[PDB]
A paper describes a structure:
During bacterial translation initiation, the 30S ribosomal subunit, initiation factors, and initiator [name] define the reading frame of the [name]. The first step during bacterial translation initiation is the formation of a 30S pre-initiation complex (30S-PIC), which comprises the 30S ribosomal subunit, [name], initiator [name] and all three initiation factors. Upon correct decoding of the start codon by the initiator [name], the 30S head shifts from an open to a closed conformation, and the 30S-PIC transitions to a 30S initiation complex (30S-IC). The structures reveal that all three antibiotics bind within the E-site of the 30S and preclude 30S initiation complex formation.
Further sorting of the subpopulation with initiator [name] revealed two distinct classes, with and without the additional presence of IF2, which were refined to average resolutions of 2.9 Å and 2.8 Å, respectively. In contrast to the Ksg- and Ede-30S complexes, the density for the head and initiator [name] in the GE-30S complex is better resolved, enabling models for the head and anticodon-stem of the initiator [name] to be built and refined. In the GE-30S complex, the head adopts a closed conformation and the initiator [name] is accommodated, such that the anticodon of the initiator [name] base pairs with the AUG start codon of the [name] in the P-site of the 30S subunit. Thus, the GE-30S complex has transitioned from a 30S-PIC towards a state resembling a 30S-IC. No clear differences are observed in the GE-30S complexes with or without IF2. Interestingly, although the initiator [name] can base pair with the start codon, the presence of GE blocks the canonical path of the [name] in the closed form and prevents the initiator [name] from displacing the CTD of [name] from the 30S. Therefore, 50S joining cannot proceed because the clash between the [name]-CTD and 23S rRNA H69 remains, thereby preventing the association of the 50S. However, in the structures determined here, with and without [name], GE is located in the E-site where it overlaps with the -1 and -2 nucleotides of the E-site codon of the [name] from a previous 30S-IC complex. By contrast, GE appears to allow the transition and, unlike Ksg and Ede, actually stabilizes a closed conformation of the head where the initiator [name] is accommodated at the P-site, i.e. forming codon-anticodon interactions with the start codon of the [name]. We could show that GE stabilizes [name] on the 30S and we observe all GE-30S complexes with the CTD of [name] at the P-site position, allowing us to propose that GE interferes with [name] release during 50S joining and 70S-IC formation.
Numbering used by the authors:
A (entry chain G): 2 to 4, 13 to 72, 89 to 126
B (entry chain K): 13 to 129
C (entry chain J): 76 to 177
D (entry chain U): 2 to 65
The structure:
RNA sequence: GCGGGGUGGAGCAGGGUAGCUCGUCGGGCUCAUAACCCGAAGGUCGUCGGUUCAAAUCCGGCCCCCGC
RNA sequence: UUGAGUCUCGUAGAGGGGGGUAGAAUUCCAGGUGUAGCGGUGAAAUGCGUAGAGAUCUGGAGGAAUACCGGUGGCGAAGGCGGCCCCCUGGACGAAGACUGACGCUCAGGUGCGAAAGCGUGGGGAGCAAACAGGAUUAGAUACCCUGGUAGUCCACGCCGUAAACGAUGUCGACUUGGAGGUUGUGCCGGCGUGGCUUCCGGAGCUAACGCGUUAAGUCGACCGCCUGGGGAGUACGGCCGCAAGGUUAAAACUCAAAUGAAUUGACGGGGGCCCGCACAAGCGGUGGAGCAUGUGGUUUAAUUCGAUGCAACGCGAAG
RNA sequence: GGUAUG
């Protein structure tokens, strides 16, 4: 003004991602959607779940110059926004399909 | 057509518009291009970028004459003074002498009245 | 193309704009005549005139004062004008007679 | 402001020299003052206020 | 007599594919008002059909209506 | 002979009048090259351009003004005066003397000079530009803005006689602490003096205060001009002056109880400077659309009890 | 950044 690691992969970037996906404090609901999405992603790509997630972020990450914290924050926000718009049936698959694309 | 080794880039940089004209050394017109003719209209013309584009299209007009040397002759207080010559050098002409024309009366005629705005 | 010129000559066809003189329930003869003059001009120079009367606060309770002003304009601008529209109700606080060149 | 690019000089360095040649010579300031007519009383008034400012800054530099 | 046109209340755009202006109403903005901004309601488009895949559209009749 | 003049020698200066001339720039004309824009604004349009513009280059024509130097620099009674050169010409200042011997100061009336606009006659006319024409803007736009554009601006001669013609400060003389500069002489040995003009600050003193302050608005003397509440009014009438526009001299009735100056405290400013608050920005979730709850306005009613109304009334007094 | 009016 005028004046925590995600517990399944050790990436805080995914802990942030859970938080952006989360609605109404429902953090466990959010966690399941994202993990389900990452395993789905891995089965239809074939990496460790972060590499595919990070390649998916690289395509969205915007370059006034965006600095790298806002960059990944924007990317993840745009991914989640893009995912929620779609007509795939669950958010897990919406997220998996959006990440794939 | 004729080939010309060395040319002259006359940059009429007014406040509202930029005219870039490549001539021979004797001031015979080879090609010209303006910010107004570069898909900028109104006060879009009076930016450095619109002059930059006008320079590039002027360079493209005089590709056939096979010019590599240009002497620059910038004239006026226009926003696109330096952006033209920068973009002319980017086209790949070796800029020799860089020179400010700009007609100054030594007194001369009475100017129009000040705009009350 | 200088084609354009065709339009410039085309554009020497013409155009009517409507010009809006706002009267108030109690404007005085002097200013009436000034605004009346403005309209004569407007009209004679080939233009329409959205004449508006604009009741303010309680004045809305004597709308009939207003209507008399309009009716005076109609009756003065008689040989110059025909009265596209007259009002009867007082929507908002306004009465918006539109006159046109006879 | 005539700037021949000397034996083996970059453009960016050469452009800095040209812009500086114009800045010293007084071309953009000169064109702008000659854009609209200033009548002598305005000219003289402007020249007085500058002289007052210049001098008053020296008396602010002094007494300090 | 000869034509034009009949299009939301207003008037004016618009071979099929109806707006635009101002009313008209409500909202927003403001301390308040005008200005400004947004939304909605208003036509079936003179009528009668034929005719065109299309009827504001095309073609005629008719109602016209004023200009003349 | 100390005031006031004259002479000798030298100095600085946009002082004045006349003539000539230089370079830059705008416009225009004629060509060459060239090709679709140019110009303009807050945004546009009018306008200009394929009968070739704008741009660029060569040449020509014409008028007006003199960049830099340039300076709270200079000169002039004031108005004003700015390229360079010559001719004619006015004033100021310094150094030493020599000379005249109060020849002085001020000045009603008078006489002349007197920015710009304006007027008459005849020229001239690039640029600029009242009026005007068109294009915009707007509630309107007789404007501000845009494109054009006539008088005029320029010259000669004559007229006008006014300006915030201001230092809003009459002219002349004498006297009265200082400081820092500028400009222009001059003596003496960069320094040390000494004259003229001039800028800024400030002491006593003065002043309502602001301020002025050896260039006084201080302390005095000479002479002139002028003021006597505001508006009416620098108007009417009369005279004088002018071709005219108008100028100059200059009231009264009446009406008002004020008008006014400087400064103080606020407040305010589409004045400047520095800060803060979920004020904005960055976010996340809403309201505004739907249904319903609730309050209010309105309307209705026999009554729809009274109160709360921008922020700071409206699930508020009412916790039923 | 500039619109007026109580
Ligand atoms: N017309 C009416 O009755 O009302 C409208 C008027 O109030 C508009 C208002 N106008 C202005 O301030 C004038 N200032 C002087 C130059 C002209 C004009 O600009 C205005 O808002 N301007 C805008 C431009 C504009 C005009 N119409 C719509 N918009 C503007 O930018 N004004 C500037 C400002 O307010 O600082 C400035 O005055 C300006 C720049 N350029 C121009 Cl033109 N004007
Ligand atoms: K006498
Ligand atoms: K003229
Ligand atoms: K005091
Ligand atoms: K008289
Ligand atoms: K009296
Ligand atoms: Mg002088
Ligand atoms: Mg003067
Ligand atoms: Mg005297
Ligand atoms: Mg004159
Ligand atoms: Mg004359
Ligand atoms: Mg002009
Ligand atoms: Mg003009
Ligand atoms: Mg006087
Ligand atoms: Mg006086
Ligand atoms: Mg002082
Ligand atoms: Mg006094
Ligand atoms: Mg008089």
């Amino acid at each position: 003004p005028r004046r925590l690691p995600d517990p399944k992969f050790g990436s805080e970037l995914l802990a942030k991602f859970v938080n952006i996906l989360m609605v109404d404090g429902k953090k466990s609901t959010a966690e399941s959607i994202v993990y389900s999405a990452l395993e789905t992603l891995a089965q239809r790509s074939g990496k460790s779940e972060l590499e595919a997630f990070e390649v998916a972020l690289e395509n969205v990450r915007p370059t006034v110059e965006v600095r790298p914290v806002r960059r990944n924050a924007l990317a993840m926000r745009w991914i989640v926004e893009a995912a929620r718009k779609r007509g795939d049936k669950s958010m897990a698959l919406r997220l998996a399909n959006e990440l794939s694309d | 057509r004729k080939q010309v080794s060395d040319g002259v880039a006359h940059i009429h940089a007014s406040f509202n518009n930029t005219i870039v004209t490549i001539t021979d050394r004797q001031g015979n017109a080879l090609g010209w291009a303006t910010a107004g003719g570069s898909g900028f209209r109104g006060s879009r013309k009076s930016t450095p970028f619109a002059a930059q584009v006008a320079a590039e299209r002027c360079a493209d007009a005089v590709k056939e004459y096979g010019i590599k040397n240009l002497e620059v002759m910038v004239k006026g207080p226009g926003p696109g003074r330096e952006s033209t010559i920068r973009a002319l050098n980017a086209a790949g002409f070796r800029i020799t002498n860089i020179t400010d024309v700009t007609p100054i009366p030594h007194x001369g005629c009475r100017p129009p009245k000040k705009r009350r705005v | 193309e200088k084609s354009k010129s065709s339009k410039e000559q085309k554009k020497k066809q013409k155009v009517i704009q409507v010009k809006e003189i706002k009267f108030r329930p109690g404007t005085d003869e002097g200013d009436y005549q000034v605004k009346l003059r403005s309209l004569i001009r407007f009209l004679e120079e080939g233009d329409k005139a959205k004449i508006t009367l604009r009741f303010r606060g309680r004045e809305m309770a004597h709308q009939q004062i207003g209507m008399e002003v309009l009716n005076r304009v109609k009756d003065d601008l008689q040989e110059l004008a025909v009265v596209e529209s007259f009002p009867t109700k007082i929507e908002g606080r306004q009465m918006i007679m539109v006159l046109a060149p006879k | 402001p005539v700037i021949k690019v000397r034996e083996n000089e970059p453009f960016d360095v050469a452009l800095r020299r040209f812009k500086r040649s114009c800045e010293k010579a007084g071309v953009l300031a000169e064109v702008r003052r000659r854009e609209f007519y200033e009548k002598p009383t305005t000219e003289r008034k402007r020249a007085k206020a500058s002289a007052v400012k210049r001098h008053a800054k020296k008396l602010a530099r002094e007494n300090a």
